[PDB]
Specification:
Strand content of chain A: 15-25%
Helix content of chain A: 10-25%
Order of helices and strands of chain B: EEHEHEEEHEEEH
Oligomer: heterodimer
Region (Interaction with METTL14) (chain B): 82-86, 96-112
Shape of chain B: globular
Region (Gate loop 2) (chain B): 139-147
Strand order of the largest sheet of chain B: 6-4-5-3-2-7-8-1-9
Largest sheet of chain A: 8 strands, mixed
Keywords (chain B): Acetylation, Biological rhythms, Cytoplasm, Differentiation, DNA damage, Immunity, Innate immunity, Isopeptide bond, Methyltransferase, Nucleus, Oogenesis, Phosphoprotein, RNA-binding, S-adenosyl-L-methionine, Spermatogenesis, Transferase, Ubl conjugation
Number of domains of chain B: 1
Region (Positively charged region required for RNA-binding) (chain B): 97-110
Structural class of chain A: alpha/beta
Largest interface: A-B, 54 and 50 residues
Order of helices and strands of chain A: HHEEHEHEEEHEEHH
Number of domains of chain A: 1
Number of strands of chain A: 8
Number of strands of chain B: 9
Strand order of the largest sheet of chain A: 1-8-7-2-3-5-4-6
Distance between the termini of chain B: 34 Å
Number of helices of chain A: 7
Site (Interaction with METTL14) (chain B): 70, 73
Strand content of chain B: 15-25%
Radius of gyration of chain A: 20 Å
Bound molecules: bromide ion
Chain lengths: 282, 211
């Protein structure tokens, strides 16, 4: 067909601009069974979500062990110096990030989602995953369209192509078997891509769809967002970061939402078990 | 300078006869620790590929998937490259939409193929920043990677000799020498390469070297 790489060279319109039907809310409007699976799972998440919890903390100085109980999923977006190339808060080198004692708070089986940028972080973030005790198991690419501002809007290090995406590396800790651990993960409900328009200059937020992918995939209710900001505070998550303006976190109260008579797992309905993707009989 | 190719077993061909290339590209049959309907190369066979002799200054495009995201990085290192970009091919259907269904990955479904970009030495005469690092194209016929990558490489490094390992008949084209076991015989045009091929294989049989 058409060569959208050539079209970019000619016009400044990025190839990803011509992917159709990428919107989150409008996704499966024409696909009613897919829409129903997502709707039921989001309802299941909402039913079991803790109220928003958040703590202002200097993560470099903080004793990370003060965050209890253990976490089923951890979302980490340390502010990289490449996001600012207009710095305000402390920027983090990959050495700084690696020193975080993530293994001290991750549950024995759990997942991590690490925003790595688009340069050296793709390699150094993998080293961090090793250090923290995870295996890299997926790579969620946030692909940015420039429909509003064609089209050569670049450039940072020793790159040779224009970098139009960011990578969120996913890691697994512990043993998780898709055949037996359907009470912990719902695999294959989302794809490893997010497609949105390039944010306004100086807006460093990541797409909220990353939360949907994490929440759909892991049934663990104990969810930590490190380096989250006021605008990312969200039910079902504990948000911790230096730029938070207020704190309401109480480790004992937070833990009580997951202990008896509750579970740290969301559970599942029969309707979702019948809709979600599963392997066939052996 | 027109299309050139050599049908061969990549592990056995004495690649020292082809000279130096500004771009090397390989889409190898990685052992991804999964069941596959085609033959693979072991990790050790991949590591021992004589990539270093193909190039002193230039670029490597290495398609990777699964556990080869990390093994491909290790090969880049062993072969003397630093990774400076990562291209993804976003696969679309006939309506230019992402196919989101099926079970196409171990944990999440998979909508792209990755290509590591490595640099070696100190190349000159390249045009940085002409293309994006995202390719959008439908899956066509037998293609394992999108044909768009050849135009990106040619815009990056126009007029230079390039070499492709594990290539297929569809991939032969001007400025490239294509190596792979599915190619039809041997077709060399560069008189320098022809001369060295004859000296090394006096009767045309590219067999495993006499250990
Ligand atoms: Br650690």
């Amino acid at each position: 067909h058409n060569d959208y790489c050539q079209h970019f060279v000619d016009t400044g319109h990025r190839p990803q601009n011509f992917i159709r039907d990428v919107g989150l809310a409008d996704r499966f409007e024409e696909y009613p069974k897919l829409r129903e699976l997502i709707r039921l799972k989001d309802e299941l998440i909402a039913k079991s979500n803790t109220p928003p919890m958040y703590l202002q903390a200097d993560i470099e100085a903080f004793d990370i062990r003060e965050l209890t109980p253990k976490f089923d999923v951890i979302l980490l977006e340390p502010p990289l110096e490449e996001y600012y190339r207009t710095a305000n808060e402390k920027c983090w080198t990959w050495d700084d990030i690696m020193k975080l004692e993530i293994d001290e708070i991750a549950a024995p089986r759990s997942f991590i989602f690490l925003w790595c940028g688009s340069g050296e972080g793709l390699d150094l973030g993998r080293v961090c995953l090793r250090k923290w005790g995870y295996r890299r198991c997926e790579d969620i690419c946030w692909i940015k369209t420039n429909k509003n501002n064609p089209g050569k809007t670049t450039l940072d290090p020793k790159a040779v192509f224009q970098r139009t995406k960011e990578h969120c590396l996913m890691g697994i800790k512990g043993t998780v078997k898709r055949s037996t651990d359907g009470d912990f993960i719902h695999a294959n409900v989302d794809i490893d891509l997010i497609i949105t328009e390039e944010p306004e200059i100086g807006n460093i937020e990541k797409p909220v769809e990353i939360f949907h992918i994490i929440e759909h995939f892991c049934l663990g209710r104990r969810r930590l967002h490190l380096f989250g900001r006021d605008s990312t505070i969200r039910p079902g998550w504990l948000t911790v970061g230096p730029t938070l303006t207020n704190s309401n976190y109480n480790a004992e109260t937070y833990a009580s939402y997951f202990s008896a008579p509750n579970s740290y797992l969301t559970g599942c309905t029969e309707e979702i078990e019948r809709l979600r993707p599963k392997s066939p009989p052996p | 300078f027109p299309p050139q190719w050599i049908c061969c077993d990549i592990r056995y061909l004495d690649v020292s006869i082809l000279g130096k290339f500004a771009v090397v590209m390989a889409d190898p049959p990685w052992d991804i620790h999964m069941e596959l309907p085609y033959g693979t190369l072991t990790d050790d066979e991949m590591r021992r590929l004589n990539i270093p002799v193909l190039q002193d200054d230039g670029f490597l495009f290495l398609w990777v998937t699964g556990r080869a995201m990390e093994l491909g990085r290790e090969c880049l290192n062993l072969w003397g490259y630093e990774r400076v970009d990562e291209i993804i091919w976003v696969k679309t259907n006939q309506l230019q939409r992402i196919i989101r269904t099926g079970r196409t990955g171990h944990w999440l479904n998979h909508g792209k193929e990755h290509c590591l970009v490595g640099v070696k030495g100190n190349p000159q005469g390249f045009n940085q920043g002409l293309d994006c690092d995202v390719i959008v194209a439908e899956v066509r016929s037998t293609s394992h990677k999108p044909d768009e990558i050849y135009g990106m490489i040619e815009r990056l490094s126009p007029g230079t000799r390039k070499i492709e390992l594990f290539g297929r008949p569809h991939n032969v084209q001007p400025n490239w020498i294509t190596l792979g076991n599915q190619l039809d015989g041997i077709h060399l045009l560069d008189p320098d390469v022809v001369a060295r091929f004859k000296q090394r294989y006096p009767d045309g049989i590219i067999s495993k070297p006499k250990n």
